[PDB]
Structure formats: C-alpha cells, structure tokens
Structure 1
Amino acid sequence: QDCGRDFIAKLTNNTHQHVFDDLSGSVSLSWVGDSTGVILVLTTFQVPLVIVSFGQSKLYRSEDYGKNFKDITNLINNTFIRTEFGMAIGPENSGKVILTAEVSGGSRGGRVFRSSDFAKNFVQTDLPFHPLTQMMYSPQNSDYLLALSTENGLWVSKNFGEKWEEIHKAVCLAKWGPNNIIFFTTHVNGSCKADLGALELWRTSDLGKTFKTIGVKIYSFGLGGRFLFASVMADKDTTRRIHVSTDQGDTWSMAQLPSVQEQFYSILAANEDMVFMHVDEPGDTGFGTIFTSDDRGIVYSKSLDRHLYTTTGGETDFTNVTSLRGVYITSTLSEDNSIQSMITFDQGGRWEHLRKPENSKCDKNKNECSLHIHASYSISQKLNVPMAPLSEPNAVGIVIAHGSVGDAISVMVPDVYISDDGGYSWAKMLEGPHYYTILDSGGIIVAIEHSNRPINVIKFSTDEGQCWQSYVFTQEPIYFTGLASEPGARSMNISIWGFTETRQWVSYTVDFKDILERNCEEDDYTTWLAHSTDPGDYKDGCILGYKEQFLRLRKSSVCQNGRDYVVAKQPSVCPCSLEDFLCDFGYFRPENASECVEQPELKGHELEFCLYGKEEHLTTNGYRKIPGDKCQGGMNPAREVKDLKKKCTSNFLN
C-alpha cells in the first residue's frame, strides 16, 4: 500500500470522554448550530401515545464542544420525551430547538421547551393540546410552526411555539408549502382511515384565517420540488391517478403516461425541473417502471424498466447522488432475475449498468462480480445494511455506500464502497457493514463497524475516502449507538456515543484539528471532470449541458482544505448530444442503447395526451430536452405538440 501515514498522538490528546451515569431509555445526542460548541444529550422513552406514564427524561448540555456536560434535567422537570419525537431542531442557522414532552403525571396538554439561541437558554410553554406528531418548521420562516394534535386538530404558532391556535379540527395530514402555505387533508363523519379516497385537500395562506378547497376524493397528497401531488380516487373501481399542480393547487392535471391501467403509482423524487415516477407492473410482481416528466410534471416517458420495489411498503433503491448534479442510482431486475445497480448521469435520460470496481479479481458467472449498491430496497428486504448511500453536495463526487457482489455471503454481509466521481467508479474500502458520516465538506469521512460486539475503533479518511486509517479511541469498547458530526462546512469534530453492559452511557468527541493542522496547498489537489456517457473529449465533464472542473485531494493527503471542490469560475456551455434528451412520450431506450425507439404497442397509433382539459397531438423524432439541461448547439431534434379540437378530462378533483 502507498497510503503512508504518528497520527495517534494527534488524536489521543483530542479525544474527549464523558461518562453519563444512571441513564435509562434511549440516549440521543445532537450538535446544535455551527461553531457554537453546543451538544445536547437527551434520554427518551418508548411509550404509546395514548398512555399516561410516570417518567423523567434526562437532559445534558455541553458548551465546550463535548469536553464537559452539565446536567440540566431540572429544566424539563417532571416531563419525559418520547423516542419517536426526540428533538425538533430547526434550520441550520436558525438557533431554534424545541423539546416536545409530556407531563409525568399526565396533563391536558403537552409541554414544549423552546430555545432560540442554539439551546443555551430554554423557556417552558404548555400546549393546549396533545401533539400526535412532532412540530414542523415552516421552510420560509422558522417562527411559524404547525402540529397535529391527538384529536386531529391542526394547530399553528406564529411566534415560535409560545402561542398556539387551532385552525381546523378534522385534519389527517398537514404539510408546509412555500411562502408559509399550509396544505392539509380533512374529512367529516368518520376517521381518516375510514375516509381514504374521500378526503378533501385544503390550502391556507393566512396561517389559518381563510381556506380554499383545492381537491376532493383525495386518497393522499405530497410535495416535491415545485410540484404538488394528489392521488385521487375517480371511479368507484378504486383506481387511483396522480394529479400534479404547479400553482399551489389552483389548477391540476392528471399524469399522462404512455400506454395506459389499474396500476399503482409512486413519486420517487422531484425537484424544480422534473418528477421521477414509479409505476408498478400489473400483477404486483415486485418490479415496475420509472417515468420522467417534462418541466410541468404532466407528460411522462419511460426512463428505466424493471425497477425493483418492495411489495409491502413500496420502497426502492432509488438514490439521489447529491454530491454530483444529475446523478441517480437504483436497482433493477435483469432478465436472468439477478439484481443490478443502474446509474444515470443525465437525470434519467439514459441509464447504464454500474461499473464493476477495479482490483476486484473475481472473474464463475457474468452476473457475479456485479456491484449492487444497497439502499431502501435492501433496507426493506431486511438486508444487513445500516445506512443508505451517503453523499453531500459540498463534498463533490463523494459517495459512501454499502455494496454486495452476486454471492449470498456478500448479501448477508455487505462491504463499504467509496466513489469519488459521483458513482461512475467504485472501490471496496471497508469490510462489513458500517455507520458512516461525511464532514469538513468531504475532508473527513468517518466509519464505525456495525456488529453485535462492542467497538472501540474509528475508521477515518482525510483524502476523500482513498486512504483509511483506524484510530482506537478508547480501551473500553462500547456497544455503538450513535455517530454525529458537528455542523459546518469546515467542521472537524465528531461525537460517538454508546454504552457498556444496567448500562453505562459514554460519549467520545474526537477533534481532527491536529490531524489536519497543515493547510492544503496547490499540490494537494488534482482536477477532474465529471463522467459523460457520450464519447469524445468535447463533452468530457458536461452535466446537463454545463461543464465545470472539479477538485479532488490527492491520494494520501492529510491537510485541511479551505476552498470549494467546484471551481467558482465561469461554467462553459456544452453542445447538445443524445445524453441531453429524455425519450419523448411513447418512446424508450432499450438496454445499453443511446437512441430512443418507439414503444412497440404504440407504433401505427397517433401519440396523444391530455394537457389541462385539452387533447394534444404529439409529433416527434423521439427525444425531448431534459428539464434543466442548458446545452446549446449540436443535436436539435424537433417535436410538435399541436392542439386538437377534442376536450378530455385531465382533472378528477375540484
């Protein structure tokens, strides 16, 4: 190995232990705020919601980055927090922390402990209701809160939880929208479970003063990107159709999929540009089809066939690689019924098989050596996968994830794989399942073994996952409970907590400041360009029509980086090629193919769909520009959506 390195001493005097005596129930630990030194340790209990129990949560606060903790349990005197609730941390730079508790003796309402200075000072407030779910911060204003009571009342606070007001009494689900909009479902005469498919979707812009009914016959609803979704039960055949709105519910249009029937729909992801939709195959055989939308979220086309989903739950391995724009990974079922990982580098326009890792000299079956990246489908299938793939936008290109080969042994015990180029290439870095975390904007990666035995080893990397070192952080191994990174782009502190076994809790805070004492210089970085699936240099590094140069620490780097891995210079526009286009409505890409062909059952038939009550006729060469793609020049295939005379029904709510 050429990783090289002495580092023990730099960590030994930077490892801070705190023993928490006489703790029952689960222990939560959280850093509060960037560069505040604040850590909260909170004990919670698993108690049913309808049950009044006598208990006392313990609460500890550190203000020196985990070196010392003060018992501040007297603040939450005669209350306890439920494990499901935990803490209600606000936005990153908000300073808001709410501890939602219940009174030990029982009370008519819950009790919240509110802080607006990164948990340095709390005030107590009694609720006029029992919260059914944790309070929700409004993304636009952290002073606006909503909560659902145990009597299904929708409560709203304007002044950060001090004063609460009930605005509707029969609410099933409520979600914040943009600009402090509240969307919620309601019903009459019965329960929410009984009135499924007959709920009403309401909207509020006044924090509860006036309402608008934006949908009826509602089965469920959700938000994603700039899109509002609603599953509507039109016919009494229990058939459900997804309706999409981009104007906060004022106008709706049913999702238009090619070759429609009696299928189950699911939104995998959605941003400001497009919608990923999953549609189960008729028969509930465990695989479906991914469709991508246009920029209105209405017109869909085939993106990926045989997409695996869990029958009970609907989970898929669909993974947004947030560290590289336009990159998504998921799992499909081959014709040989072997699991495959597929990756797209163009937001679902084209998918390719995940490349085998280098140096894995396995060579028995062609479907062996295949790297399956584990996510929510693996989780749902009860595979030993403690974490989904992890990535951060500021840590450009880094993905850490559990993976397995085609062997049953590998599926029982997955390994930890690293990619530095957004998932184009992978390498096995750690044996066995681990919990992991990225911090210092990718400058530090930490992993901790997941097993039944107590652990005392931190595995860390400072060169974005290319070299790993083990640090024994204690001589009394602990049963692992949690791993938490200090927030912040240049954060260098991690917190491990766990127990020995009555049990004794302990937290270890490790500071990588002395490990990274040397600031990186020019030689410590290497440049790289993102992978593009079309051949040639001319589009090397192009993502959705944009070319940017990326930075990466050289292998064996041990130095603190202070710059962005995405160079803050002029991005160049790339020429359009096939990778910049989705297949059009009614077209698809066969496996390994770059060109779209028409779906066989649609050949000889006119391509038509309904766009807000109007019949539209589609003439196309088979391609349409990916939403958000900024390419100019080169490929420019034509398409035309001409308005017809006929009017159809694209909206089954009102």
Structure 2
Amino acid sequence: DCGRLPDFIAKLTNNTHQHVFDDLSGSVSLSWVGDSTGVILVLTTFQVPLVIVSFGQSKLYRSEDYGKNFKDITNLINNTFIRTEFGMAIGPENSGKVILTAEVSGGSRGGRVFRSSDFAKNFVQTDLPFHPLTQMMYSPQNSDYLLALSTENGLWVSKNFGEKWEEIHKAVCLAKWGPNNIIFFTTHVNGSCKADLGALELWRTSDLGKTFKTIGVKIYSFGLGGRFLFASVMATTRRIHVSTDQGDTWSMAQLPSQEQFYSILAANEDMVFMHVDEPGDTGFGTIFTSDDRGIVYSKSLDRHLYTTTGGETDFTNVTSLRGVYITSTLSEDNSIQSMITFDQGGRWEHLRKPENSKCDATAKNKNECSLHIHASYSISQKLNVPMAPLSEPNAVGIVIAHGSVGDAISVMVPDVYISDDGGYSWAKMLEGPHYYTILDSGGIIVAIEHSNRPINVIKFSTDEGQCWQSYVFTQEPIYFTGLASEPGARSMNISIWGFTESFITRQWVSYTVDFKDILERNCEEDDYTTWLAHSTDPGDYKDGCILGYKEQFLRLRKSSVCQNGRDYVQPSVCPCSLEDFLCDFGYFRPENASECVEQPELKGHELEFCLYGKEEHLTTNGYRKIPGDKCQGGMNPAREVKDLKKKCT
C-alpha cells in the first residue's frame, strides 16, 4: 500500500516560483531552451490567415533564472507578430538554436526571422526574401541547414542558419529533408498542386540545389521512414514503391494478395510497418511488416482501425520497452480493442484489462470492460484525450496513457492508466483526462487535470506511477494552458502556465516548480524489485526474452521516495521459439492463434514475388526470423528464396 504523508508541501512551496504577465493578448506559448541553461521563452501569437496583411505586435518574455523572473524583450521583435501555426522553431537539444518566424506588422516584401544560436540569450534579425508558407525545417544532419516553402510554392534553402537564403526550385508542392542533408521535393506538371493528383514529379538534390535528379514521375505522394523512401505512383490505380538508395533504384512493394490508401506506421533501420486499407472503403485495414529491404511484406494484423479522413491510427511505439507496439483493431462484433505485440509485429495479443476494475463491478456483460488505449485514432475521432501515450527509453517499462472501457461514458471521459511493464499490465491511476510529463528519466511523473474549471493542483508520483500525491501550487486557480519541463536526463523543473479570468480580461501567469528536495536520498537495493519482460511463448526458459535476448529490469518499490533510479540492467541469448519469427510472405497468424498459416487464396499456387526486376520463388515452412532478433538454437523453420532468372510477372 502507499506511504501516507511523506510531507512534500514545505519542500515544494519554497521551490515554486510564480510570474504574472500583464495584458497579454492572443495565444501564449512557453518553452524551456536548453538543458541547464536557465532560459525560458514566453511568446504571444495570433491566429491570422497567411494571405492576409494585418497589424499586430507579438510579445516576448525571457527568463534566465529558471522561471523566477522574466524580462520583457518585446522590443527585439518590435513591429512584428508570430502566427500561432508557426510558433517557435527550436533546433536540436544541444544546438542552442531558436528561430522566431514572424510577419511584419505593416506588411513587407517577405517575412522576418529572429535567429539565436546561444539558447535564446541573443537574437539577430533577418529579412526573408520571401513569405514562408510553412515553418522552416531544420536538416536532421545539420541544424545550420534550413528549408522553407514560400507562399508562391518556391523552395528556399539556407546554409548558414537562416542568415542567407537562396531559391533552388519553383512550383514545389512538398519538400522534405532526407538523410545526409538530401532534399526530396515534388514539382508541378502544370497549374495547381491540388489538381495534379498522381501527375507530380519527385525530385532529389544532394548538394542543396546545385544539381537535381528526377527520381519519380506520375507521383501521387511520397514519404520517409527509417532508411526507406516511399512513393505512391499512379499507373488509374496506385502502387507503392520503395527505395533504400535515395531514389536511384525503386522496387514495388510486394504484398500477398501497393493499394489505394497506404500509410507508413513506423520504420527504422531494420523493418517497416505498413498499413493498407481494406477493399471498398471501411474503417479498417491491415498491418504488413517487411524485412530490412522494405520490399517483401507479410500479414501482421487484421482489421486495423484508421480514420478515413486523414489516415490516423492508434499505432503506438512503446519506446520504453524494446519490441513493444500497441494499436487498436475492430473485433468481429465491431467492438474496439487494443492489441499489443512484444515481438515487433510477429504476434499480437489482446491488451489485458486491469484486475477487479470498477467496470467489473458494474458490467452487465463481458467484453464491456476491455481496455482501449487512446492514441491518434481516438484523437482524430474527436474524443477527449488531450495526450497520446507517453513513454521514453530511459524510463524502462513506464507507459502513461488515456484509456476507456466499453462504456459510452468512459469513452466520453477517459481516465489515465499506468503500466510499469511496457503495457503488459495496466492500472487506472487518475480519474478523468490529464496532461502529463515524465521527469528525471521516470523518477518523477506529473499530471494536471484537463477540465472546464480552473485548477490549482499538481499530481506527481515518484514510484513510477504507483502512488500519487497532490500539490496545491496556488491559492488562485488558473485555466490550464500548458505544461513544459526542462530537458535533461536528471530533470527536476517544470513550468505550468495559464490564466485567471475574474471578468472578461485574461491575466496570464506561470508557475515553475523544482522537485529537487523531494528525492533526497539515493535508492538502495531494498528499494527495487526485479521483473522480466512478457513473453507469449510458455516456459521459464523464455521469460524475459526480448527478440532473442534475455534481460532483467528493476522497478521502484511502491511508495519509494528516492533518486538514483539505476539504469535498468549481462546479455544472454534465448532458444528460438515461435515468438521469434514473423509469418512469411503469404502466411499469417489468425487472431488468437500462435502458429502461422498460409492465406487460403495462395494455398493452390506457388508463392512468387518481384524483387528489383527479378522474379523470385519462395519455399517456406511459414516463418521468417524477425529482423534484429539475435535468437539461436531451438526452433528453426526453413525458407528459400530462389532466383528464377526471369523478368517480373
């Protein structure tokens, strides 16, 4: 049971610093700039259409002492304002780069940016030779490289952190940074980008506009994931093509029985999750997985729910436990259900419902108490879930997410559920929707109620979400607007901002809380327990095996109040079992089934597919080893990919 009253109020009251901002208009954004810099930026923005020239003044405040004091530096951005859609363009964590993209209050020949490379302590002003259509994008491999699309659909690039800009191509519809500062972009065949569905050209430049190469024609769309480049190509019908050499060579995606709607759910250096819409136009599709070449796919999960307008799904990478992914499917009776995989798409199981839930006490029927974990599918469906599932690799096994059972009331007002074993087991910890953040690599989790009333409570947990305490951080409740944490692995600082509205005018205020005094002592051996990740194959020899590697994790004991949450850790290999294999091309695991079985339609014919112009023949026991799985010994089904020395089809 939880430890009642380790007194925190005194240690938090003296570490809570309020700042009132007078006469702020528009939306107010707050952000920490850097780890251990002390810098917090507060900026007001305005919702103004791009084409409209209007007058306005954004306000800008800066703290250099961790939120205790703010200096008005609006004079730096005199006679400009920033649109809410743009906000701040903050570079990578250790770069110190911040860019404010603004519009001149009276109008001008182009936009105006304010550039800082010292954690927002000094800005320089630069007039753009164009009006930005969207926010400027940093190159992932070089924060000095910026690209921006103009309102004239021109592609502009800067090599020196936005100081000097050059237009490298006109009539561009979409542009994206690839790897090693490559730029991919689409261009017109004629008039409008909207009217030219399926007739765009995909272009590549590897030297920031000096030379170009057309890598695709008749393009519907394109995207990037992991080491893979994807393009939807119009033949009257759409097919998916994959490239792992930045478009020099393409191969059509090979799916058993490339369709009208596709989506890359996730992709890394090892594999691809691909969603393909079911024939006709229903609310569900199918998840396919590929090898590290991104070409040959196999059926992974049926009836995967997606929003027909936008393609969002509940697909969630559980980043706090290797190999774990969660998403939502439509059961046979059209109930929503959360499925979870612990082997990177090889096998999926129903998410387990909490034991002895309040739902179990009132449910007049089973399956009513199934737990649906809310993500982008719920959010796009306009449900009241203010945050997707939250996890981070440093906080091993911790997942925080909104969830609902099979009641309309629960769907309307989700609750916050906590998992400490990467999603295998869940407990309802907070009533109603919340905003939440992880600090101190999981040593501190904080949540704030999301409702119509003004709030004055911080809820926090120091034992990975098992026990919660409430801290009244003000006597004047605020309509909550934002929650922002200082970055860093050992973070203790968090800022809340919002406003009072006793009459018609909003008075904005920020509260910065330092949790330094709460976690005084360092955890010892009796403060932890040990746990092994869940395995779907039975046997003590298979407990704790993740993709062929057995490992052991710690977990803070319930009611713990201590720091030094050691990094959860000698590697050992497991024997091979079914959980270490995906189904092969043409095979699948029926719902609730452990073994792969050949899809019925292919039972008659030989399994063949196209691989870079060469037709291949597949003989298989129905299995192929999961990319990245270091399994050895045990079960080893056989497969052979024989080249037929023939052109495709």
Q: TM-score, normalising length from structure 2?
A: 0.97
Q: Counterparts of 1:169 and 1:618 in 2: how far apart (Å)? A: 46
Q: Counterparts of 2:409 and 2:197 in 1: how far apart (Å)? A: 43
Shift of 1:366: 1.9
How far does the alpha carbon of each residue in 1:189-227 deviate from its partner, in whole angstroms, 9 at most, with x for none?
211112121111111111111111111111111100011
How far does the alpha carbon of each residue in 1:409-460 deviate from its partner, in whole angstroms, 9 at most, with x for none?
1111111000001000000000001111111101111111111111111111
How far does the alpha carbon of each residue in 1:356-405 deviate from its partner, in whole angstroms, 9 at most, with x for none?
11231544222111111111111111111111111111111100001111
Shift of 1:537: 1.6
Change beyond 3 A, Cα 1:262–1:155: closer
Q: Counterparts of 2:290 and 2:354 in 1: how far apart (Å)? A: 32
SS of 1:184 mapped into structure 2: strand
How far does the alpha carbon of each residue in 1:432-490 deviate from its partner, in whole angstroms, 9 at most, with x for none?
01111111101111111111111111111111111111111111111110001110000
How far does the alpha carbon of each residue in 1:324-382 deviate from its partner, in whole angstroms, 9 at most, with x for none?
11100011111111111000001100000001112315442221111111111111111
The answer on 1:333 being equivalent to 2:330 is yes
Q: How does 1:246-395 map to 2 (within 5 A)?
A: 246-259=244-257, 263-360=260-357, 362-363=359-360, 364-395=364-395
Percent of aligned pairs sharing the same letter: 100
Change beyond 3 A, Cα 1:7–1:262: closer
- Does the CA-based 8 Å contact 1:320-1:328 persist in structure 2? yes
- Structure 2 residue runs of 5 or longer lacking an equivalent are none
How far does the alpha carbon of each residue in 1:600-636 deviate from its partner, in whole angstroms, 9 at most, with x for none?
1111111111001111111100000111111111121
Alignment correspondent of 1:17: 18
Shift of 1:295: 1.3
Alignment correspondent of 1:216: 217
Shift of 1:522: 2.5
- Does the CA-based 8 Å contact 1:170-1:188 persist in structure 2? no
Q: Superposition RMSD on alpha carbons, in Å?
A: 1.2
Q: Counterparts of 1:551 and 1:435 in 2: how far apart (Å)? A: 26
Shift of 1:553: 1.2
Shift of 1:520: 2.1
Shift of 1:188: 3.5
SS of 1:312 mapped into structure 2: coil
- Does the CA-based 8 Å contact 1:42-1:58 persist in structure 2? yes
Q: Counterparts of 1:204 and 1:251 in 2: how far apart (Å)? A: 15
Shift of 1:262: 5.5
SS of 2:394 mapped into structure 1: coil
SS of 2:142 mapped into structure 1: coil
Alignment correspondent of 2:3: 4
Q: Counterparts of 1:23 and 1:625 in 2: how far apart (Å)? A: 58
- Does the CA-based 8 Å contact 1:181-1:207 persist in structure 2? yes
How far does the alpha carbon of each residue in 1:293-320 deviate from its partner, in whole angstroms, 9 at most, with x for none?
1111111111011111112121111111
SS of 1:454 mapped into structure 2: coil
SS of 1:10 mapped into structure 2: helix
SS of 1:362 mapped into structure 2: helix
Alignment correspondent of 1:652: none
Q: Counterparts of 2:238 and 2:260 in 1: how far apart (Å)? A: 8
- Does the CA-based 8 Å contact 2:403-2:415 persist in structure 1? yes
Alignment correspondent of 2:75: 74
Q: Counterparts of 1:588 and 1:365 in 2: how far apart (Å)? A: 31
- Does the CA-based 8 Å contact 1:186-1:201 persist in structure 2? yes
Shift of 1:149: 0.9
Shift of 1:647: 1.0
SS of 2:31 mapped into structure 1: strand
- Does the CA-based 8 Å contact 2:189-2:201 persist in structure 1? no
- Does the CA-based 8 Å contact 2:359-2:405 persist in structure 1? no
Shift of 1:505: 0.4
- Does the CA-based 8 Å contact 1:490-1:562 persist in structure 2? no
Shift of 1:499: 0.6
Q: Counterparts of 2:207 and 2:94 in 1: how far apart (Å)? A: 25
- Does the CA-based 8 Å contact 1:241-1:265 persist in structure 2? no
Q: Counterparts of 2:610 and 2:489 in 1: how far apart (Å)? A: 46
Q: How does 1:142-291 map to 2 (within 5 A)?
A: 142-234=143-235, 238-259=236-257, 263-291=260-288
SS of 2:322 mapped into structure 1: coil
How far does the alpha carbon of each residue in 1:560-616 deviate from its partner, in whole angstroms, 9 at most, with x for none?
225323xxxx32122221111100001010111111001111111111110011111
Shift of 1:43: 0.4
- Does the CA-based 8 Å contact 2:556-2:565 persist in structure 1? no
Shift of 1:551: 2.1
- Does the CA-based 8 Å contact 1:268-1:276 persist in structure 2? yes
- Does the CA-based 8 Å contact 1:31-1:484 persist in structure 2? yes
Q: Counterparts of 2:62 and 2:563 in 1: how far apart (Å)? A: 29
Shift of 1:548: 2.1
SS of 1:144 mapped into structure 2: strand
- Does the CA-based 8 Å contact 2:259-2:277 persist in structure 1? no
Q: Counterparts of 1:381 and 1:179 in 2: how far apart (Å)? A: 37
Range moving further from structure 2, 638-647 or 449-458: 638-647
- Does the CA-based 8 Å contact 1:263-1:281 persist in structure 2? no
Q: Counterparts of 2:159 and 2:264 in 1: how far apart (Å)? A: 31
SS of 1:291 mapped into structure 2: strand
Alignment correspondent of 2:495: 495
- Does the CA-based 8 Å contact 2:240-2:252 persist in structure 1? yes
Shift of 1:547: 1.9
**Counterpart pick for 1:542 among 545, 555, 559:** 545
Q: Counterparts of 1:631 and 1:154 in 2: how far apart (Å)? A: 47
SS of 2:265 mapped into structure 1: strand
SS of 2:9 mapped into structure 1: helix
Q: Counterparts of 1:523 and 1:66 in 2: how far apart (Å)? A: 37
How far does the alpha carbon of each residue in 1:16-71 deviate from its partner, in whole angstroms, 9 at most, with x for none?
10000010000000000001111000000000000111000000000111111110
- Does the CA-based 8 Å contact 2:299-2:583 persist in structure 1? yes
- Does the CA-based 8 Å contact 1:76-1:113 persist in structure 2? yes
State the number of aligned residues.
Answer: 640
- Does the CA-based 8 Å contact 2:259-2:276 persist in structure 1? no
Q: Counterparts of 1:331 and 1:262 in 2: how far apart (Å)? A: 21
Q: Counterparts of 1:60 and 1:355 in 2: how far apart (Å)? A: 47
Change beyond 3 A, Cα 1:61–1:262: closer
Change beyond 3 A, Cα 1:262–1:297: closer
- Does the CA-based 8 Å contact 1:129-1:149 persist in structure 2? yes
SS of 1:402 mapped into structure 2: strand
- Does the CA-based 8 Å contact 1:457-1:472 persist in structure 2? yes
- Does the CA-based 8 Å contact 2:578-2:595 persist in structure 1? yes
Shift of 1:150: 0.9
Shift of 1:532: 1.1
Q: Counterparts of 1:613 and 1:446 in 2: how far apart (Å)? A: 54
Shift of 1:542: 1.2
Shift of 1:641: 1.0
Q: How does 1:537-616 map to 2 (within 5 A)?
A: 537-561=540-564, 563-565=566-568, 570-616=570-616
How far does the alpha carbon of each residue in 1:85-105 deviate from its partner, in whole angstroms, 9 at most, with x for none?
000000011110000001101
- Does the CA-based 8 Å contact 1:464-1:553 persist in structure 2? yes
Q: Counterparts of 1:602 and 1:249 in 2: how far apart (Å)? A: 32
- Does the CA-based 8 Å contact 2:189-2:199 persist in structure 1? no
Q: Counterparts of 1:467 and 1:283 in 2: how far apart (Å)? A: 48
Alignment correspondent of 2:424: 424
How far does the alpha carbon of each residue in 1:536-571 deviate from its partner, in whole angstroms, 9 at most, with x for none?
121211111122222221111111225323xxxx32
- Does the CA-based 8 Å contact 1:14-1:512 persist in structure 2? yes
Shift of 1:113: 0.6
Range moving further from structure 2, 89-98 or 306-315: 306-315
Shift of 1:645: 3.8
Shift of 1:648: 2.1
Q: Counterparts of 2:394 and 2:437 in 1: how far apart (Å)? A: 13
- Does the CA-based 8 Å contact 1:292-1:302 persist in structure 2? yes
- Does the CA-based 8 Å contact 1:135-1:147 persist in structure 2? yes
Q: Counterparts of 2:87 and 2:211 in 1: how far apart (Å)? A: 32
Shift of 1:525: 2.1
